[PDB]
Design a protein around this ligand. Structure first.
Ligand SMILES: COc1c(O)cc2oc(-c3ccc(O)cc3)cc(=O)c2c1O
Length: 273
């Protein structure tokens, strides 16, 4: 009985993902986020080990929600006649990376390094768990402003990770790779790496590098803010036009720009408090 266990608060947001509310679990006052998704708007379905028809999003969240992480944790879910309701952990205080960048503009490289590193660790965790997010971008990253810890949120466009080609995509187009634009084909890891290149550029420049399809497939990167050569190099590497010319996660994290990352707590003390 959903209505009983949780006390619902203000609507946090709504859009392609559904409607998400602030809430608190009655039993122990735990902060929570309560996400409603209408059934008729769910295209991708899956099955629990148990073998129950649920949204893929729930399957993926269960796969990654084991242990601690830079990934939002699913605490519970409920089915209703016309919708599924998901109960997720809610950090407090929090701000999404899109709003944070709106407010503060292009981020100092030290801060972008710390943030980008944590995104990489979260994405690796998803991939280790057999999950491909497919919509990595600033709007899908929450900052725990007190702990300086980032977390990945909306798995609504995700899929099981596989080594064969994907021919479907319903993530964010301006973060989608040229091979998707030209051929409607991509492989998971290398498409993720492209979206990570877009994200890093977004962090250090305060906006995404490409708006239009033709810019995406041309793949020419213009830097509108002062950005160090090492950071430009990593970004251009992530945005290589040929999928196989993109770095692996290991190569990103071994990149010279990625060395000597701040810890999350230092990150909050220096840049968020
Ligand atoms: C996994 O799917 C989602 C999603 O699609 C949107 C979300 O939004 C929030 C949130 C919290 C505070 C804000 O100020 C704004 C958003 C928390 C979530 O946990 C959350 C979520 O798990």
């Amino acid at each position: 009985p959903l209505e009983s266990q949780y006390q619902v608060g203000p609507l946090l947001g709504s859009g392609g993902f559904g409607s998400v509310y602030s809430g608190i679990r009655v039993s122990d006052n735990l902060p929570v986020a309560i996400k409603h998704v209408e059934k008729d708007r769910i295209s991708d379905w899956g099955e629990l080990p148990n073998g129950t028809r649920v949204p893929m999003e729930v399957v993926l969240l269960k796969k990654v929600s084991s242990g601690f992480s830079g990934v939002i944790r699913l605490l519970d879910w409920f089915e209703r006649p016309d919708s599924f309701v998901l109960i997720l952990e809610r950090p407090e205080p929090v701000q999404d990376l899109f709003d944070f960048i709106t407010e503060r503009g292009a981020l100092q490289e030290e801060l972008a390094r710390s943030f980008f590193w944590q995104v990489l660790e979260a994405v690796r965790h998803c991939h280790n768990c057999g999950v491909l997010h497919r919509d990595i971008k600033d709007e899908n990253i929450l900052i725990d402003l007190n702990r300086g810890e980032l977390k990945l949120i909306d798995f609504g466009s995700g899929a099981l990770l596989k080594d064969t080609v994907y021919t479907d995509f319903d993530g964010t187009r301006v973060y989608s790779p040229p091979e998707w634009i030209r051929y409607h084909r991509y492989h998971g890891r290398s498409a993720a790496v492209w979206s990570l290149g877009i994200l890093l550029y977004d962090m250090v420049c305060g906006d995404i590098p490409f708006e239009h399809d033709e810019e995406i497939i041309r793949g020419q990167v213009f830097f509108r803010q002062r950005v160090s050569s090492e950071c430009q190099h990593l970004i251009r590497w992530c945005l290589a036009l040929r999928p196989s010319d993109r770095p692996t996660f290991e190569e990103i994290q071994n990149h010279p720009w990625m060395q000597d990352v701040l810890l999350p707590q230092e990150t909050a003390e220096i840049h968020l408090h």
